[PDB]
């Protein structure tokens, strides 16, 4: 699932956009007020707010402790998609930036090939400019790599753990019993690699989340094209070129035609500024969402359904995206269910002390001899003091005397 | 001060006449008599400087100090001296081959009685043929001299006034403070501005005189003045600065006086101030505009072809309106003066064009429709007319630029070139078919052949004649008219339709370099295509001429000689101004452009960056976001940046006076290593401190 | 407010920005043409102000929900999540009024100097019958043996005591020791 | 929805809010002038 | 091809004189003399 | 091949222009016929064997 947390920072030369450097148009524009100063201040304000939002987001993502060798030193968990290997991006970040149809403008010498030889090349004729990002592509990837290397800290109250031990402690708190993990270590790792391989091979036009990454780029491209396409509209005048209006028509009627061009250009610029404000509000909401998603899913385990992906959350990985952040949520999806019955809590007929199930249920194996199983996997076992607690007696508790568990005897 | 509207305590953009920033002007010095003694002068009667939207004079200044006498070598206290100007419309030469003579009427401004009265007389100054005065073969200069205690009586010695209109006298109180004086000519007359209006407490200038002078002054000179007395006294130097049509950003105070302004094209920081309309700015990277990208040249080329046959309009007989003739002119150059010199035009109706622009301008075709029609029924050709002319004879197509010229040819010219009208003239007054309804005429079409053949067949007026033609019978009507004026002249109507297109635009006006204008903003007029842009020489179909863009923006031009020219808009290179409020220093970012391009467009940049980039080289660094000027590479890494430049790039403000180009470094977290063993290493603190985050 | 107030003086292509001057100077046919182009500018200004107020109302609704979350997670109780309730590790927060909103003063726990150390997942004897794990800390070691317990946010070696170590299940990665075992495990 | 539907009856300075009546009542140049100020109003409604 | 303005690599909404889709038109065929005299034509 | 009458005369279009590399048609002639054409017919012909 993908969240878009960055708008396209652009600056528009208002005077060149509206009047194309013609003194007659600039004389007629001054009776519409201080439009260019207001538009310049609005664009500078939204760009400054976007820079502050990026700084705050990356300061929230930053983790004080990380293990850079954890993603490479692991068991059968093929974690090479998020492994940092020139380019400091991981395999998934490179895959996201390569499979998307994004035209990155030349920030260092892009004027030399746009001219002297396309929204990255139409900015030098339409009088706008896409500002470069606040952080380099490498520097953002080091933040993402440090976050990925810090995933396997100790969940309880820093501490560096192997990835296998960390997913073991996550699935133990899921509800799967102690003895199941030791008997299915190989099967669990082989099941993890199958899901990651399926997510690797699904990068096509079939998954909706990558299509969101494409729609963000398409929205930015449509906004820039809509900004640049009003230089050809006449808006009812003889032509869209101010010089042709000045050459063809007399002084009294040039005012009418130039004014009806000016109103169209003003409407286009104001519509662009309002769109940038709405997109800035969306980016602020999505930035708060990304902060919450990172700090909860990537740095801990979720106790709430739906958030941190569907199913029941185990581990999440956050990587960079062309316009935002990309999250990979690994969940626990059970397949086959077995119907059973259990009790709120069992105890002897005297009701002196009574116990309750901890992270599971007290199932019955036959007509008697109550056992304990995990809440997420079926594995009956004798009741032990480390999987039950002493609680208050209740009137709905089961009364048993034939076979007493060692907490009850 | 901008006359017409008074402002107070605001900050707006003006577009009046102002001098450019850091203009030294021209400095003039007045001398004394020597130690009989002789005047001492400074060749000031030979220069006829251009007027050029007026000038401004800094009267006084450099005063209250120990100056230097010009004669000999002596020092004395400097005092304010009022300049005497001499303004005229036409120049020439004295009869000594020495310049400085103003023919016709001459506005002469000169002070009276040690600068307590200002006299501005405006009249002709005839030279007086005497010895050593103006108008003789032996002549050096004219000097306006006066003792210590009138200047016009000294002007009577050299020149002889004749036929003199007025003489305005203005009173001025003698002081020693610095005074501003300015002159400006408009449609009302020659306005005069001084800083002594509304009290004398500022350097702003307000209008105090409007002399009626209705022909434009183009030249001005300064009387060489010397005052009869070495170490006696000294006189100040007045400076004259020219007024240019440009923009300031001004700031008014509480009593509505200008206390500070900002020349928009002067610096990069003033381009920032003018682009945002604000004086006091905050630190940050901004986006500035070009306030110095005005065009500085001109270019005009067009295809040269044979002359169009516009002489067919004035031969054979004048056509009837019912049988008018049409000519379409393509692939030829046209001379419309051959049309407009033989006729007396007294009405033109045009849309999407003007007759002034019909003579110039290049089209794709030229459709001319002409017929004979009296001027008394010229409202039948008007738009929306319900008469029989506009529905059966001639319906005008208004989808294209047209000009309907109602012109007459007098009998002398028409008899010279054999233009005659002797047959009957008539128009179709009815064009019904067999069914009872009229056949209306489409826009821009000849009359219906069934009605036109029948109407041209008849010779007498009839309203409901039954014509046969071929097959179905058409009921037609014929009404006659006389196009010849009873004086003898013939009245014509010419409809000229001009078709514009983006193609080759072959038909162009008839008339009887680009390498010198490369790299500057110029006005180009190439094959009927007008606009603004700079030109470069890029590598090269060399027959479609204008290579376009997907947005139909012209990106290059193929010259006729074979070379390929590389145009761009005058404002195309994006400019970011890095301003720091604490240090009050500015730097410039030219984003996304390689740093060879800026060195070949120094004309369109600001007035200070042009002089920095034209005098030698260096100062330009190639970053990952562009070419900066005003930076220096420092190889320093920072963790936070108050002026973020781009891709992990800082800008350290100065504390020469150049910004430091630092990069953002990723502060690594405390690295921990994973465990193979059972034991796992931990990071625990041993010292803390409370921190707040508001 | 300045954008709303300063566009009354814009002529918008008319001869003047005053309706009375247009009515006095012009005939009844051109009065419509000039007054209409003033009217269009005024309507554009009012519609722009209303749309801007709608967007600002959206921002205010989102920030009001944010302030409710900040108060209920920072001020009335301390927060267990990083980044939220200020940077560092949250301890206490104060909320005060601001001109257009609310001001929060978050006080955090910021460590300065760190000491490297080694610890263990658990701690029990060679029999591996009952095993313990540290509570709110790690089981540090001061040499060959004699495992001790310190806090997770401050270094202070303390003897292992039953109120700071709960009994957990035995595990195959737990340490085995029989020399100076703590009283919970003896 | 009411604001979308009820601004089709506004003339916006034209002689009528119906294009057919404008084409019936005016010549070509005033047709071009008066239809454009209806068009601007409809574009403003759709963009809003 | 729309005269008066050229285009290059762009999808644009045109308007002009074009034939409607899936029109068969009118098919005319020529021949030789019927079988070298008596030429063979249609009406 | 295509024909079209305008206000400037009768235009003639063919696909052989610009090297004859496409099926698009470009203007190659403009006959000075200012009578608006109403009808057209196909003249029969037969080439010798
Ligand atoms: C377009 O047509 C007009 C009119 O035919 C041209 O104006 C003509 O220009 C010639 C060239 O100078 C003039 O001839 C001059 O005649 C005087 C004596 O009359 C002679 O002394 C000069 O040496 C010269 O030969 C002619 O008078 C003038 N005619 C008119 C009516 O103005 C015009 O030149 C044409 N445009 C171009 C670009 O050629
Ligand atoms: N006979 C005589 N006449 C004069 O008018 C005269 N004026 C001066 C004035 N000399 C000076 C010396 C320095 C600067 C000067 O430093 N000006 C700065 C501009 C800054 C400012 O002073 O306001 C400069 O740009 O040079 C000006 C005038 C001296 N002797 C004179 N002697
Ligand atoms: C400008 O001055 C010239 C003379 O330098 C004036 O020309 C004289 O005009 C008068 C009156 O028509 C004639 O009697 C003279 O014969 C002219 N002399 C010469 C040499 O041409 C001219 O009229 C003045 N201009 C104006 C507009 O008055
Ligand atoms: C030369 O000195 C005189 C007086 O010594 C100056 O005149 C004063 O200028 C100040 C400046 O605003 C005024 O406030 C006073 O009212 C003036 N006093 C008089 C008596 O006029 C004069 O400005 C000095 N000149 C220069 C160039 O500084
Ligand atoms: C109506 O006008 C047309 C053209 O304006 C005349 O046609 C010309 O006739 C002369 C002699 O009859 C020919 O030499 C020209 O070649 C014709 N030109 C064209 C374009 O057809 C026609 O004669 C006029 N009708 C009448 C009755 O005078
Ligand atoms: C991990 O997967 C990649 C492709 O998904 C594969 O090339 C690589 O060999 C795998 N590594 C292991 C250890 O299976
Ligand atoms: C268990 O015994 C207690 C006391 O005799 C009684 O209150 C309770 O209802 C019994 N539970 C069941 C499930 O019968
Ligand atoms: C002039 O403007 C300033 C702010 O720029 C303000 O403080 C001051 O009150 C204004 N003066 C008057 C008389 O209103
Ligand atoms: C002025 O020039 C003319 C010719 O140019 C010459 O005949 C005459 O002698 C010159 N007079 C003086 C004083 O130089
Ligand atoms: C001045 O007068 C002398 C003789 O008196 C004569 O030769 C000369 O031409 C005159 N010059 C002028 C300009 O009248
Ligand atoms: C100055 O005075 C002397 C006599 O006192 C006189 O001859 C001379 O012309 C005067 N200078 C003038 C009026 O310029
Ligand atoms: C100028 O001053 C003189 C004498 O001091 C006086 O007669 C005249 O009226 C004054 N003119 C003006 C316009 O003040
Ligand atoms: C035509 O020329 C003759 C001879 O020059 C002249 O007498 C006659 O007045 C001229 N016609 C007109 C209308 O002036
Ligand atoms: C006018 O016609 C006469 C008749 O012969 C001829 O001599 C003369 O040259 C013609 N003039 C012009 C200008 O065609
Ligand atoms: C044009 O091509 C030549 C051939 O390589 C090259 O040297 C030159 O730099 C090119 N010039 C431009 C402006 O591209
Ligand atoms: C600045 O210097 C460093 C090291 O000397 C170099 O790596 C860097 O590329 C330089 N930057 C520029 C813009 O030349
Ligand atoms: C903690 O650090 C501060 C600043 O480095 C120092 O002044 C203080 O003495 C330190 N306290 C201890 C116990 O080390
Ligand atoms: C502690 O002993 C048990 C049983 O002998 C063994 O399974 C476990 O691996 C031992 N722990 C270590 C750290 O060797
Ligand atoms: C437009 O031109 C580019 C480069 O010449 C080409 O790759 C592309 O296929 C063309 N068409 C479209 C629809 O972009």
Q: Is D13 on the interface with C (CB under 8 A)?
A: yes
Distance from CA of B670 to the nearest CA of C (A): 10
Report H helices in B399-484: 411-416, 449-457
Between chains, do A108 and B286 touch, taking CB under 8 Å as contact?
no
Structure tokens at B93: 């030469």
Which residues lie across from B575 on neighbouring strands? B288, B590
Residue B666 to residue B111: CA distance in whole angstroms:
73
CB contact under 8 A, B503 and E9: no
Give percent helix, percent strand, percent coil of chain E, each to the nearest 5. Answer: 0, 5, 95
How far apart are the C-alpha atoms of A199 and B76, rounded to whole Å? 94
Q: Do chains F and A touch (3 or more CB pairs under 8 A)?
A: no
How many Å apart are CA A385 and CA A86, to the nearest integer?
56
Residue given tokens 């307000």 in the structure block = B206
Residue B337 CA to ligand 1 centre (angstroms)? 10
Q: Which residues of A touch B666 (CB under 8 A)?
A: 139, 142-143
- Find out whether B438 and B391 touch, Cβ atoms under 8 Å: yes
Tokens representing residue C167 in the block: 């009994």
> Is-contact C117 B681, C-beta < 8 A?
yes
Contact between A211 and B531 under an 8 Å Cβ cutoff? The reply is: no
Kindly state if the Cβ of A401 falls inside 6 Å of ligand 7: no
Search chain B and give the residue with CA nearest F10.
B328
Q: Enumerate the residues of chain B whose CB falls inside 8 A of the CB of residue E6.
A: 502-503, 544, 548
Measure CB to CB from residue C110 to each of B678, B681, B690 and give the nearest one. B690
Rounded Cα–Cα distance for residues C173 and C131 (Å): 11
Task: Annotate C76-142 with DSSP letters as a single string.
Answer: SS--SSSSTTSSSEEEEEEEEE-SSSEEEEEEEEEEEEEEEEEE-S-EE-TT-SSEEEESSEEEEES
Tell whether C36 is within 8 A of chain D (Cβ).
Answer: yes
B346 in contact with E, Cβ within 8 Å = no
- Under 8 Å between Cβ of B593 and B626: yes
**For B445, which of F9, F32, F36 is closest by C-beta distance?**
F36
Looking up tokens 């700090």, which residue turns up?
A295
Alpha carbon of B154 to ligand 9 centroid (Å): 28
Angle (CA) B401 B407 B411, round 5°: 155
- Reported as type and span, the H/E element at residue B547 is strand B546-547
Instruction: Round to whole Å and give the CA distance between A180 and A191.
Output: 15
Q: Which helix (H) or strand (E) holds C42?
A: helix C30-70
- Tokens 């051959």 belong to B338
Nearest residue on chain A to D37, alpha-carbon basis: A236
Residues whose CB is less than 8 angstroms from the CB of residue A72 and which lie 6 or more positions away in sequence, other chains included = A79, A83
- Phi and psi, residue B228, nearest 5°: -70, 135
Ligand closest to the CA atom of residue B98: 9
**Nearest ligand to residue A72 Cα:** 6
d(CA A168, CA B213): 99
Distance CA A14, CA A128 (A): 9
Instruction: Look at residues B213, B179, B187, B237 and name the one whose alpha carbon lies nearest to residue B56.
Output: B179
Integer CA distances (angstroms), B73 to A386, B61, C130, F28, in order: 113, 22, 113, 87
C17 HSE (CA, 13 A, CB side): 12
E7 touches chain F (CB under 8 A): no
Judge: B685–C115 Cβ closer than 8 Å, yes or no: yes
The percent helix, strand, coil of chain A (3-state, each to 5) is: 45, 10, 40
* Ligand 6, CB cutoff 6 Å, lining residues: A 78, 80, 197, 200
Helices A251-293 and A35-61 meet at what angle, rounded to 10? Answer: 10
Burial label for A374, CB within 10 Å (0-12, 13-18, 19+), is: buried
Dihedral angle over CA of C151, C155, C161, C165, nearest 10: 30
Residues of A in contact with B589 (CB under 8 A): none
F7–B330 C-beta distance less than 8 A: no
Question: How many inter-chain contacts (A to B, CB under 8 Å) are there?
Answer: 214
Cα distance between residue A176 and residue A170, in whole Å: 10
**Nearest protein CA to atom 7 of ligand 2, as residue:** B62
Contact A31 C13 (CB under 8 A): yes
Give the C-alpha separation, B369 to B380, whole Å: 16
Buried b (16+ CB within 10 A) or exposed e, A382-404: ebeeebbeeeeeeeebbebeeee
CA B418 / ligand 14 centre spacing (Å): 6
F41 interfacial to chain B (CB closer than 8 Å): no
Q: Residue B376: is it exposed, middle or buried by C-beta count within 10 angstroms (0-12/13-18/19+)?
A: exposed
Distance of alpha carbon B80 from alpha carbon B61, whole angstroms: 7
Please tell me the distance between residue B219's alpha carbon and the centre of ligand 9 in angstroms.
Answer: 24
Three-class HEC string of B568-594: ECCCCCCEEEEEECCCCEEEEEEECCC
User: Would the CB of B64 count as within 6 Å of ligand 4?
Assistant: yes
The closest of C93, C90, C109, C69 to B694, measured between CA atoms, is C93
Q: Cα distance from C60 to chain D (closest Cα, Å)?
A: 22
Cβ pair F17, F29 in contact under 8 A: no
CA distance A234 to A261: 6
**Residue ranges around ligand 5 (CB below 6 Å):** B 319, 323, 325, 456
Beta bridge partner(s), residue B245: B17
What is the C-alpha separation between A334 and A351, in angstroms, rounded? 37
* Residue partners of C128: CB distance under 8 A and separation at least 6: C170, C174, C176
CA distance D9 to chain B (A): 27
Task: Tell how far the Cα of B254 is from the centroid of ligand 8, in angstroms.
Answer: 6
Burial of A318 (C-beta count, 10 Å sphere; 0-12/13-18/19+): buried
The pair phi, psi for residue A156, each rounded to 5°, is -80, 170
CA distance D27 to chain B (A): 6
**Which position has the token pair 């150049």?**
B658
Residue with tokens 């690994």: A330
User: How deeply is B611 buried, as exposed, middle or buried, from its count of CB atoms within 10 A (0-12, 13-18, 19+)?
Assistant: exposed
Instruction: State the CB neighbour count (10 A cutoff) for residue A20.
Output: 23
- Listed in sequence order, the DSSP H helices in chain D are 2-6, 19-25, 28-47
Residue pair B493/B406 in contact (Cβ under 8 Å)? The answer is yes
DSSP assignment string, B485-502: -TTS-EEEEEEEEEE--S
Question: What does DSSP assign to residue A349?
Answer: T
Ligand 13 atom 5, closest CA = B412
- In a 13 Å sphere around the CA of A295, the CA atoms on its Cβ side amount to 23
CB contact under 8 A, B328 and F9: yes
Which residues does B418 contact at the CB level (< 8 Å), separation at least 6? B315
Closest ligand to Cα B254: 8
Tell me the CA distances in angstroms from A142 to A95, B206, C82, one per residue in order: 17, 65, 20
Of F4, F27, F46, the CB nearest to E39: F46
Which residue is associated with the tokens 């009593």?
Answer: B255
Helices (H), A62-161: 91-99, 110-114, 123-126, 137-149
Q: Which chains touch C (3 or more CB pairs under 8 A)?
A: A, B, D
Is B623 a pocket residue for ligand 16 (Cβ < 6 Å)?
yes
Contact (CB, 8 A) for A116 and B538: yes
Residue A299: other Cβ atoms inside 10 A: 19
Ligand nearest to the CA of B37: 11
Distance CA B309, CA C26 (A): 47
Q: Which chains have 3 or more CB–CB distances shorter than 8 Å to chain E?
A: B, F
Chain C CB contacts of A273 below 8 Å: none
Residue with tokens 């230097």: B68
Map residue B680 onto helix, strand or coil: strand
């Amino acid at each position: 699932e993908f969240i878009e947390t960055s708008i396209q920072k652009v600056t528009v030369d208002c005077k060149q956009y509206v009047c194309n450097g013609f003194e007659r148009c600039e004389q007629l524009l001054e009776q519409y007020g201080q439009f260019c100063a207001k538009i310049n201040q609005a664009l500078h304000g939204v760009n400054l707010r976007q820079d502050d939002a990026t700084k705050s987001l990356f300061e929230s993502i930053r983790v004080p402790q990380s293990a850079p060798l954890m993603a490479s030193l692991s068991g059968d968990y093929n974690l090479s998609l998020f492994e940092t290997p020139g380019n400091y991006r991981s395999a998934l970040e490179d895959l996201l930036f390569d499979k998307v149809t994004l035209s990155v403008p030349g920030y260092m010498k892009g004027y030399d090939e746009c001219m002297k030889k396309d929204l990255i090349c139409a900015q030098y004729v339409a009088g706008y400019k896409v500002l470069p990002p606040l952080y380099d592509s490498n520097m953002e990837a080091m933040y993402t790599a440090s976050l990925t290397g810090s995933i396997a800290g100790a969940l309880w109250t820093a501490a560096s753990l192997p990835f296998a031990q960390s997913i073991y402690y996550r699935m133990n708190g899921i509800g799967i019993t102690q003895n199941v993990l030791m008997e299915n270590q190989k099967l669990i790792a082989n099941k993890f690699n199958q899901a990651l391989g399926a997510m690797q091979t699904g990068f096509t036009t079939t998954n909706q989340a990558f299509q969101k990454v494409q729609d963000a780029v398409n929205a930015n491209a449509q906004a820039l094209s809509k900004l640049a396409s009003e230089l050809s509209n006449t808006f009812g005048a003889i032509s869209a070129s101010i010089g042709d209006i000045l050459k063809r028509l007399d002084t009294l009627e040039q005012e009418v035609q130039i004014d009806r061009l000016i109103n169209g250009r003003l409407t286009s610029l104001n519509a662009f500024v309002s769109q940038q404000l709405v997109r800035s509000e969306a980016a602020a909401r999505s930035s708060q969402l990304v902060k919450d998603k990172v700090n909860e899913c990537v740095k801990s385990q979720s106790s709430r359904n739906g958030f941190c992906g569907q199913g029941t959350h185990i581990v999440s990985f956050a990587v960079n995206a062309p316009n935002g952040f990309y999250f990979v949520h690994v969940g626990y999806h059970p397949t086959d269910y077995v119907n059973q019955t259990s009790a709120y809590g069992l105890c002897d007929s005297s009701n002196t002390k009574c116990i309750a199930a901890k992270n599971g249920y007290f199932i019955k194996n036959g007509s008697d001899d109550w056992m304990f199983t995990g809440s997420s996997y079926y594995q009956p076992e004798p009741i032990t003091n480390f999987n039950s607690r002493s609680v208050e007696p209740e009137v709905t508790f089961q009364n048993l005397t034939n076979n007493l568990p060692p907490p009850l005897s | 001060y901008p006359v017409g509207r008074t402002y107070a305590n605001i900050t707006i953009m003006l577009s009046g006449l102002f001098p450019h920033q850091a203009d030294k002007g021209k400095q003039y010095i007045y001398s004394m008599y020597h130690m009989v003694n002789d005047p001492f002068i400074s060749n000031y009667s030979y220069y006829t400087e251009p007027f050029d939207n007026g000038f401004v004079v800094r009267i006084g200044a450099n005063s209250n100090i120990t100056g230097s006498s010009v004669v000999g070598s002596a020092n004395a206290t400097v005092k304010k001296i009022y300049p005497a100007l001499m303004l005229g419309s036409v120049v020439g030469k004295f009869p000594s081959n020495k310049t400085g003579r103003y023919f016709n009427h001459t506005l002469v401004i000169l002070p009276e009685k040690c600068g307590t009265q200002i006299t501005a007389l405006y009249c002709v100054l005839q030279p007086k043929n005497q010895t050593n005065c103006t108008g003789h073969t032996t002549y050096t200069s004219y000097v306006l001299v006066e003792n210590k205690t009138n200047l016009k009586q000294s002007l009577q010695t050299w020149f002889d006034l004749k036929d003199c209109l007025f003489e305005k006298k203005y009173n001025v109180s003698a002081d020693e403070r610095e005074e501003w004086f300015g002159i400006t000519q408009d449609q009302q007359g020659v306005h005069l501005y001084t800083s002594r209006k509304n009290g004398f407490k500022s350097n702003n200038m307000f209008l105090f005189a409007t002399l009626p002078i209705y022909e434009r002054l183009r030249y001005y000179t300064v009387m060489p003045r010397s005052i009869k007395t070495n170490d006696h006294m000294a006189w100040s130097a007045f400076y004259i600065y020219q007024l240019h049509k440009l923009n300031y950003l001004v700031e008014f105070d509480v009593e509505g006086y200008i206390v500070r302004a900002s020349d928009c094209g002067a610096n990069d920081y003033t381009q920032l101030q003018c682009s945002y309309g604000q004086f006091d700015m905050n630190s940050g990277v901004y986006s500035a505009s070009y306030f110095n990208a005005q065009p500085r040249g001109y270019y005009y080329v067009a295809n040269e072809l044979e002359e169009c046959a516009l002489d067919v309009l004035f031969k054979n007989i004048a056509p009837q309106i019912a049988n008018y003739s049409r000519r379409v002119f393509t692939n030829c150059n046209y001379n419309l003066t051959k049309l407009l010199s033989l006729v007396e035009v007294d009405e033109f109706v045009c849309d999407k064009t003007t007759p002034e622009s019909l003579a110039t301008g290049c089209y794709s075709s030229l459709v001319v429709d002409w017929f004979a029609l009296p001027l008394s029924m010229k409202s039948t050709l008007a738009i929306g007319s319900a008469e029989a002319i506009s529905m059966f004879n001639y319906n005008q197509d208004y989808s294209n630029p047209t000009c309907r010229i109602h012109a007459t040819i007098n009998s002398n010219v028409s008899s010279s070139l054999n233009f005659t009208a002797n047959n009957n003239y008539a128009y179709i007054s009815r064009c019904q078919g067999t069914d009872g309804k009229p056949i209306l005429l489409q826009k821009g079409q000849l009359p219906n052949i069934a009605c036109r053949s029948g109407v041209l067949g008849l010779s007498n007026d009839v309203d409901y004649f039954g014509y046969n033609f071929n097959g179905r019978i058409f009921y037609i009507g014929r009404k006659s008219y006389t196009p010849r004026t009873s004086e003898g002249s013939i009245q014509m109507v010419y409809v000229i339709t001009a078709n514009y297109a983006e193609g080759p635009n072959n038909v162009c006006p008839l008339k009887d370099n680009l390498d010198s204008l490369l790299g500057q903003c110029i006005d180009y007029d190439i094959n009927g295509v007008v606009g603004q842009g700079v030109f470069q020489k890029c590598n090269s179909i060399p027959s479609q001429v204008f290579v376009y863009d997907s947005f139909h923006n012209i990106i290059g031009y193929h010259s006729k000689n074979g070379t390929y020219y590389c145009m761009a808009p005058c404002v195309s290179v994006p400019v970011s101004v890095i301003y720091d409020k604490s240090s009050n220093s500015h730097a410039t970012l030219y984003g996304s452009v390689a740093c060879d391009h800026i060195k070949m467009i120094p004309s369109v940049l600001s007035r200070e960056t042009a002089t920095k980039l034209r005098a030698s080289d260096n100062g330009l660094l190639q970053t990952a976001v562009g070419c900066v000027i005003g930076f220096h590479n420092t190889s320093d890494t920072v963790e936070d940046c108050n002026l973020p430049l781009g891709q992990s790039l800082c800008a350290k403000p100065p504390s020469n006076n150049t910004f430091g180009l630092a990069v953002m470094k990723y502060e690594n977290p405390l690295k921990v290593e994973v465990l193979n063993s059972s034991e796992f290493e931990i990071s625990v603190p041993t010292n803390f401190s409370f921190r707040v985050t508001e």
